[PDB]
């Protein structure tokens, strides 16, 4: 970076020189009228070149050499080390007339060299390197560069980013470090100051603190901060926090600048002499698919649903997971832990923590927080395992959300949430068709499970055709009078049997139609996830149709299951009993067990004595993040 | 693309098959209970494979072969040609019990194959190719692909895109072609229709017409159109227009879909069976730098400014350009042609036209159209020649706009215009510092000129130091009493001479300060344009300071000049006369003429008898577009 500094006719010029720049110096304007040639002297630590029409020659500290004065003959001035109190850094130019070798005038440049660098960890190893040449840019990929910021959604005691205040030093651990490194003499020369600043636009995206006492110096309603200069080699440590996630209209990128400003006069703005810039990207909110290792199983249910709690506890005891049990709240649905909460995470090189998206129906440390229809529930939000589709890899998987057909006039998840998920970018969301379901959640018809002992996975699909095939076989086998819902006393008077199901003509037509809805989804998943029929297992399911021609479960949907590695908690179907075993249970075992999946059926409905299509319990599994670092992905240009 | 179609127990299935897809067919669900094996037959133009657990074998039209019934044994069904009236395309599956070789039941699939493709010129040669496999994406660069749309800002008789109506067939020439190509029998089977559609979001970005009668079928308040199906090989020609340029919040990309919809029942939404998508990018508004060939010179001035008009006409007569003369209007400034109008262009493979940005102070065919401060004027908007900066090429140059320092609280061009220019992307704008000038326009201090006989160019910078050096030389030479403004009778009583200028102490300090403002710009231009001192010439300039400490010209700014290749119209400076020639004129000739630039001084101030810092005339040159195609650029990720 070349910077212009002119000698003044005939007055001396004093200037700060910032290392990493060099000066081009006009000596011609300061020459008195009539002068012919010029000579120069300079001090030890100042390098000077005479540049005549593009050709440069280094000049000695004390030479007698003379050059013709000319607009195209200039100086180039460089310094490789900062000034100290022992420095006298200068260049002095003498001017000569045609007649005689004694100088007729003199112009000089007194310099104070300083190092100024605003530094961040742009190489993404968690430590702040000195002046990374790439620090002003942000690039994706394994070779990518530039610093990362976490949204500080934490709380120690709204969330931590809600204000401009910092209390716990623990908070600073969530924060990215930014260091202003300087070197120079005891003070800046008269008329200079160093100022950190941000744009008005980024002022709601960031906050910056300086440390027993943490001062908030940039952020909401603070766009600049004058920095105190310390001489010698000094470092000022700053901590930077993100205030919000990428979204519609916010890419995730923010910038912080430091400038050396020169005081000109009263009422004149100060001149930026030198500016250094660092860029941060705020880390996206990321979702964890069923293939990732489980950590904690969160469950909600009424206090007296005893079988559910015993059977969930038993399942979890087969694993290394912890069980967290939560009951119902006045402001939350019976399923709220599944529907109102989604466990994601954020990651930076230095730190990461799980982060919960919380969407209450009505209404900690390193667990972060944050017209409507049923499709806005997080039962309607899933994510696939890592996939490759037509050569394009999605190392974090793809987010799936249920919707309706474009021209249908049907329900759709709110634009605000869809925009949020799309803006995270690294999960490249796909819309499925959930609006044929009364509740409208993708988790009603589909799930993913890992295949034990491999790196592969399966898509599990609800299938009505599988159920009808099975029931027709059992009927052919002489089991037509086999009764469903055994043990649910509130269903007993209905006397529902395989015969009674198979003879219901309108129910058959309804379920053929629902199977078309399932198959439409099957095709989208196969296309957008790069799946073949070998990656899919069909689980028998059955639905009843409402007045809107939407489906609700006839018996509990087995596809919505707790996946803990090889161990699966599967909703107990209460299917027809053949030889004192549920034919639905036996059929599901026959599909899954050969692959090394272990099935545990979990009864969440007995406590209610009947099943009308609604489940009153919910579960959500919190998982370890992907090993793959999000910043190593190269998302498509948006 | 694999699509799911199940045989129905035991009822026949009729389906449309779209070429470019294949069907996976479940034969197991339709089998009666107890059946053991199955056999199949199929017609000549239907290819059938039995796929047993991933392994596929082609099956003959009439074989006797039997396979074990099984959920994992399915059919794969493909067709390579559309159906005609002579077609009977079918697959028939027979089912067998354990005992006996006579079929116990049968299920069948009756098919009608059709070709459906929505086609655009994605390869950017101006003709619409058949089903470009890249047509659903848009990529930058010489190897880039996907179709281009023009904003139809034209008018033949607001602009043409302002409504949904089309009159002149000439209009359709501005429009991009989109063709729906189909092939099939006389009619679609019962229960199907073909529908073109767009998102609500894109409905204000596009419009689509179908042709003596042009019907507007998609656009504002029209999101879908049912297409009439014609049998045999048919093509429906559509014309597509852009309604607006890329902007803040609009990337420039729009999508159009066609779907085959299947009617299910009353109150049920129709099922999209097949969807094809094309994407367009709306061409950006591009600015033309002074290096590009001039076409027309537009000029405005009062009717009686005779010298100006004679001298401009004389200049233009040295070239092949046409002169267009415009006078003053009540709603427009004296400079309006320079300040309120900017001539850009747009280009698509098929067509391009110049497009004017019009910003009236108060208030045709293939010339398109479209708190505030002085910085919003287009005197404050320039563009550099093509440059390369640190290896990064800007083949269309970079847009330059004047601003103030970030922390100054000074003036800045309105966010809406800045956002617009940034969104065009291909000119990668740079902000300079213009706010030290009373009027605040970059064109007051800087310009570009080509170097005749080469591919190179020069930056011209106003310089106060150059003026002081020259005046001090002339004074030393005994010319101190040389008078400026000779012939301007309204300046005569001031008796301004070189001596009087040089002895004004406060004026010297003001101009040293203005030279610091110029040099700050010089450094930004050198940095952001990749320029060295060899690419720059300094023109003498002088300013007076106002109460806000901002500059206005002391004598006419020569840097704002008409550039027609080697020929330059330069504002006549009215500088001090030495030997009956203007010393400013002679000095400027001595700089430019050796490079083969021809200088003509143009007097725009004599008609006013004095110069107070304001010029009452304006010029704007309309130029040929770059040879380089904008879509061949690869802009940085935004
Ligand atoms: Ca580092
Ligand atoms: Ca925190
Ligand atoms: Ca806080
Ligand atoms: Ca924390
Ligand atoms: Ca969920
Ligand atoms: Ca083409
Ligand atoms: Ca038009
Ligand atoms: Ca129109
Ligand atoms: Ca036209
Ligand atoms: Ca302009």
UniProtKB/Swiss-Prot annotation, chains A, B:
Changing residue 362 to A: Reduced enzyme activity. InterPro entries: Cupredoxin, PAD, PAD_C, PAD_central_sf, PAD_N, PAD_N_sf, Prot_Arg_deaminase_cen_dom. SUPFAM superfamilies: Cupredoxins, Pentein, Peptidylarginine deiminase Pad4, middle domain. Changing residue 382 to A: Strongly reduced enzyme activity. It comes from the Eukaryota. Ca(2+) 2 binds at residues 152, 154, 156, 160, 171, 174. Ca(2+) 4 binds at residues 160, 163, 165. Keywords: Calcium, Cytoplasm, Hydrolase, Metal-binding. Changing residue 617 to A: Loss of enzyme activity. Changing residue 358 to A: Reduced enzyme activity. It catalyses: L-arginyl-[protein] + H2O = L-citrullyl-[protein] + NH4(+). GO terms for molecular function: calcium ion binding; histone arginine deiminase activity; histone H3R26 arginine deiminase activity; nuclear estrogen receptor binding; protein homodimerization activity; protein-arginine deiminase activity. It is found in: Cytoplasm. The active site is at 617 (nucleophile). This is Protein-arginine deiminase type-2. The gene is PADI2.
